[PDB]
Enzyme design. Structure first.
Site, PDB file in Angstrom:
ATOM      1  N   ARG A 139       0.875  -1.172   0.000  1.00  0.00           N
ATOM      2  CA  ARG A 139       0.000   0.000   0.000  1.00  0.00           C
ATOM      3  C   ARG A 139       0.919   1.230   0.000  1.00  0.00           C
ATOM      4  NH1 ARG A 139      -2.486  -3.480   2.374  1.00  0.00           N
ATOM      5  NH2 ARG A 139      -4.667  -4.088   2.586  1.00  0.00           N
ATOM      6  N   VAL A 140       1.965   1.280   0.808  1.00  0.00           N
ATOM      7  CA  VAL A 140       2.853   2.434   0.795  1.00  0.00           C
ATOM      8  C   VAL A 140       3.436   2.726  -0.572  1.00  0.00           C
ATOM      9  CG1 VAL A 140       4.971   3.432   1.749  1.00  0.00           C
ATOM     10  CG2 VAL A 140       3.323   2.293   3.241  1.00  0.00           C
TER      11      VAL A 140
END
Lengths: 276, 261, 122, 260, 138, 260, 138
Positions: A139-140
């Protein structure tokens, strides 16, 4: 360990978390590996049922989700106002027969920022580490990649996704157009570049130099069976002879138009050497 | 050799403890004498089934699959004694039963972590007449490391596994779509795989009553080499059957002739 | 049915469907080429091809004819055939997935009911 | 916007109720000020899961698949407070997580009982650069009934999709046998479809601080006309890129001008 | 049989076994057929649940393995020191959908000295006995 | 005929005992009058279901699938009175409803052991339009012995099953690739199997309103025969459809003419 | 509806049925539509799991078939001696993925006097009513 009473196996991850928090809070950075969260869940389930609390799916207590969420949330990036310190966590979950939807694997997947999915089929097929690149996630994302890496990571990510679309065809490709026949080739070379032996982690500058090699097309005429040998030796060479270019890449943080040209020659002469 | 027994004709209780008795005898020779012990347990699953059998009478809510909620810890405090120390060395070979043939069953499943090497046998392989029925793609060892067995050992092993995997994937497909469309490149791996699949079988010296064949013991170098050659294309001419139930690669060559008619 | 059994077929019918699909795109290709090359020549797993001739079975100028024709018909035949094979493989991948999820669900409920049943008898 | 949060560390009961709290807030801007509020529950699955945790803790026997016996009521008592009353209306955008990719799993299945439409965001569409990356053929709505949106609206919509469907068919052919056995007809469905695909993309005012472009809020009337005409054949001469990231068809025209 | 009380059905195998040991312990030879051990397990399961003993895997008592091991261990070959007599057992078990991996089926396959697996496919095909060569062992 | 009823509208206990009641009536004619009885029961599965309904109320720990732990013994002391004896004969036909179509369900599963002959009906076959929807490879009869039905009968019977079993294994491949790739030999089993499958269907008077055809009653020797010929290749020229919904083979030949 | 306590959703069909029964009972003719019996079944199951009754197939309590037979037995055509009146029931059942073999659908098929199966395929393909004329029956 295995012979330590349930409660100690239960606690372990929190008591290790606290230890890593001392760094986080003091402007320092800390990494924590929980190996595994599957066994701790079992420890907790064991006490829950013996204290007679109500059992839900897989005999897990209604608060098993809360046991991990309250643990995995203590990892975080602080603000300068708080020291800018951090706590990264690498929690391990053991799936069964690849059932990522079983109970505990579902919770933890649902709690974390991404997953690195490993697969037996891949492992035995020669892909080691067994990372299933299509299902793994961050996700980052790039908010965490260096500009150097991005400079390469980006097109690699893309030809691979493209190969993944066609891969299955290979083995029966009795007559595919050279358009897709191209992606199969980039496909297998890029894949061979992701391979890696253990206990030998690389410096971001060494990774981009090698990735650049296939991504740019230099290993396209090379034999799949040789990429592993190529990289190894190619990287041995630039780590030996070219520590000034890598130092550049490193410093400049990206691949300057210059260093770009220097790499072109370094690989086109090394490759020539290589197939003599 | 000392022997300790708590067979299937015993009440759960005896079965939940013989392993302890057995293991205790072994720990003595390890510590009090400091010797090199060899420990054989057949079958450790029975220790865990023993416990599940009285569990309900001990007043416990069942965990999944009927097992007792203390399975893993019960297994842990035991498995952790079966071990080599600085005082002595134990080389434990434990047979592990797999209920309903399901390797994910809480018991077999919980035991993998206690091992350094695992030999997984499969009824699907056995069913074909391939003994020992080890599953080549589900068996592992912590020493399968180039740094420990060497790259020749290692490249062969992995070489053999890739091809068996490669063939596993094609199996279901040539099943229906047949073999014509396959690339000569791919119908050679079907070949070599089927021969390796056989070269992996072996007539045991303790199963002549079973195989009707004299038991063969093959030395590590005869093994590495035999496979190295099959993988190298050095026997693409001999028939698969020549590779079935034989010791060293030379017997496969001899057997080819005998079969030659 | 076993989730492991169902996952084998599914695993494989998913492949057969992509192979089959690929073989048609090829069959269409060659068949493009063929309908063109066919034009001129008349002014002179392949479906039921080899059999149709086989059953009813029991120079140059015309040799290139029967040839230049028997390839348009063939690459035509393989094409449609592989078109319906993936059409069939797809009805199955959609059919098996439903059996897979009915079973998947059923297995989970069956277990829990077993646990609950034993807990409740204490 | 008012933000209401039920973080993952919170105990079952908290992640259980926070969607009600958010609901409470929204009901005010409707029952007290008679607006048209928007309710966003992210994500509707964790609501249900929180329900089960709470249930299990209260020692109640789980039902099929381990969920709560009260799965349907726990949901209904909340979903039903979301409607159009005489005072105003709350509209809810609910993020759905489907377990095991099983649409018949009790969590998801129950949930669709209440949904009037789905907005399917698609990574594939995004890859076309098209944004919003909504899928025009997978996204759905209960109110897409001529008896509700009116024949015109209903026909345009059904026109846009078929064309988008047909083109989908041809997509396979084009790449393999090459783009030309294509008929005076087959070449038009494509052209338009490709114009349509683009006309369906659009600049958001939310992304102005970033796209360096001006956001567009096209009106329903403008929307139906837009697509009406492309279908119609009114801009077949216009070029594809004239329609990429614009608002009303008028802009498709003007972009063409600047694109010579 | 079918209408006999669960406990009779349950006991029946041990009863019959004991009559076979008479021959086994007296240098004579006996052969016992337990037809079938599936219905006994059900009987055991019933008797057992009605005693309020918590059900286990598949609803059977946690000791169904034990229920059959105890019994079949009794079939045996005694040495000349004990008469050289013997007891041979041929227990029967019913599978469902030819699934031999099933828990009970494997529980019993893991006690006996082999199995004869009969398939309906082979049977219909003309292969009678429907013995499945590959899956049967001694 | 004497009629006893305890239908779908009664409370569980009534449904749990009416079988016993019809049963008793029958026992009287058998033993008190040495009579040859016929006993029809629809549906005996309902007696077991009834048992499962009260069982929790009696306070019993449930067995598998929620059924009562006394399922088998309850079926047993009841099924064991439905029998012929030295005093009298009871031919009994019992319909056995299979829940969710699962024959592995404790109820039906436990009933096989009490029959001498079983007719297992199939949804799959029914859906093909074959009635009665009897599964030919799943129905059995302790009389299917050469020394009882004669070897002629015994050999046609096993003949038919063998060809249908063979067709059955080819089906997987027929399913993705059809028949093309099939061997000339294999295609003949397929032809014959599909003609045997159709010839097994037949119009019942009782189902005339649905078959659209007049009910037929075929005499055993007509059945043994018609099936021999099919097996023997004496009709490999007729079309399948000729065999569907007919009585004697002679009618299958005719239908073929009418089909022209 | 969706917001009323399960007991009310459970009850609803019986009440409506009694209202239809007045007409049936007085030489009149009524039509009752139960939409859906699927959701009534889950309401009753919520009640049953909360009362702690043994969950069975699909976690449904052992008496869900009776939940439905009792209800639908009340639709009926009386003869002249009882008024000639009648009650017609069109109960609705929602299948998942066209699976008409599920526990609840089968239950209900084994009660009514025919079915009208609507197919999703048909519906999109533009055939509406999406009736499946071969599968449906009266």
């Amino acid at each position: 360990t295995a012979s330590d009473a349930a409660p100690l196996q239960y606690l372990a991850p929190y008591s290790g978390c606290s230890m890593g928090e001392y760094f986080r809070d003091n402007g320092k950075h800390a990494l924590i590996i929980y190996d595994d969260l599957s066994k701790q869940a079992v420890a907790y389930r064991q006490m829950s049922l013996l204290l007679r609390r109500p059992p839900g799916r897989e005999a897990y207590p209604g608060d098993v989700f809360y046991l991990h969420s309250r643990l995995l949330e203590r990892a975080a990036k602080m603000n300068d106002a708080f020291g800018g310190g951090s706590l990264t966590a690498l929690p391990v979950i053991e799936t069964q027969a690849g059932d990522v939807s079983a109970y505990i694997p579902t919770n933890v997947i649902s709690i974390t920022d991404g997953q690195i999915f490993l697969e037996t089929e891949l492992f035995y097929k020669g892909i080691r580490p067994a990372i299933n690149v299509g299902l793994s996630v961050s996700r980052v994302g790039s908010a965490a990649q260096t500009r150097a890496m991005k400079q390469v990571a980006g097109t690699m990510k893309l030809e691979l996704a493209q190969y993944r679309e066609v891969a299955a065809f290979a083995q029966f490709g009795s007559d595919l157009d050279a358009a897709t026949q191209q992606l199969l080739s980039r496909g297998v070379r890029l894949t061979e570049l992701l391979k890696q032996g253990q206990y030998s982690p690389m410096a971001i500058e060494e990774q981009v130099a090698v990735i650049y090699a296939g991504v740019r097309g230099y290993l396209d005429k090379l034999e799949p069976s040789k990429i592993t040998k190529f990289e190894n030796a190619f990287l041995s060479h630039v780590i030996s002879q070219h520590q000034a270019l890598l130092s550049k890449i490193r410093t400049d943080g990206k691949i300057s138009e210059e260093s770009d040209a220097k790499l072109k020659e370094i690989v086109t002469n090394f490759l020539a050497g290589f197939e003599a | 050799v000392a022997l300790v027994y708590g067979q299937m004709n015993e009440p759960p209780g005896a079965r939940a403890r013989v392993a302890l008795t057995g293991l205790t005898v072994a720990e003595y020779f390890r510590d009090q004498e400091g010797q090199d012990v060899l420990l054989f347990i057949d079958n450790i699953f029975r220790f865990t089934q023993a416990g599940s059998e009285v569990s309900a009478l001990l007043g416990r809510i069942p965990s999944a699959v009927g097992y007792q909620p203390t399975l893993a810890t019960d297994m842990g405090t035991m498995q952790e004694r079966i071990t080599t120390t600085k005082k002595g060395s134990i080389t434990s070979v434990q047979a592990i039963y797999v209920p309903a043939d399901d390797l994910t069953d809480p018991a077999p499943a919980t035991t993998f972590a206690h091992l350094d090497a695992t030999t997984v046998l499969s009824r699907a392989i056995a069913e074909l007449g391939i003994y020992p029925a080890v599953d080549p793609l589900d068996s592992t060892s912590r020493i399968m490391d180039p740094n420990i067995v060497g790259s020749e050992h290692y490249d062969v092993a992995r070489g053999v596994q890739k091809i068996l995997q490669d063939y596993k994937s094609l199996q279901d497909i040539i099943a229906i779509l047949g073999m014509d469309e396959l690339s000569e490149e791919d119908k050679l791996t079907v070949s070599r795989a089927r021969k390796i699949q056989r070269f992996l079988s072996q007539p045991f010296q303790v199963a002549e009553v079973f195989t009707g064949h004299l038991g063969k013991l093959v030395p590590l170098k005869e093994t590495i080499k035999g496979f190295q050659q099959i993988l190298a294309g050095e026997y693409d001419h001999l028939p698969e059957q020549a590779f079935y139930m034989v010791g060293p690669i030379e017997e496969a060559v001899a057997k080819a002739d005998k079969l030659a008619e | 049915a076993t989730l492991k059994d169902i996952t084998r077929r599914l695993k494989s019918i998913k492949n057969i469907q992509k192979i089959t699909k690929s073989m048609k795109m090829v069959a269409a290709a060659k068949y493009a080429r063929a309908e063109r090359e066919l034009k001129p020549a008349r002014v002179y797993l392949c479906g039921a091809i080899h059999s149709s001739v086989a059953k009813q079975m029991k120079l140059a100028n015309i040799i290139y004819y029967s040839l230049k024709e028997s390839t348009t018909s063939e690459q035509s035949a393989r094409m449609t055939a592989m078109d319906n094979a993936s059409k069939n493989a797809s009805e199955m991948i959609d059919k098996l997935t439903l059996t897979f999820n009915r079973t998947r669900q059923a297995v989970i409920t069956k277990e829990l009911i077993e646990i609950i049943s034993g807990a409740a008898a204490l």
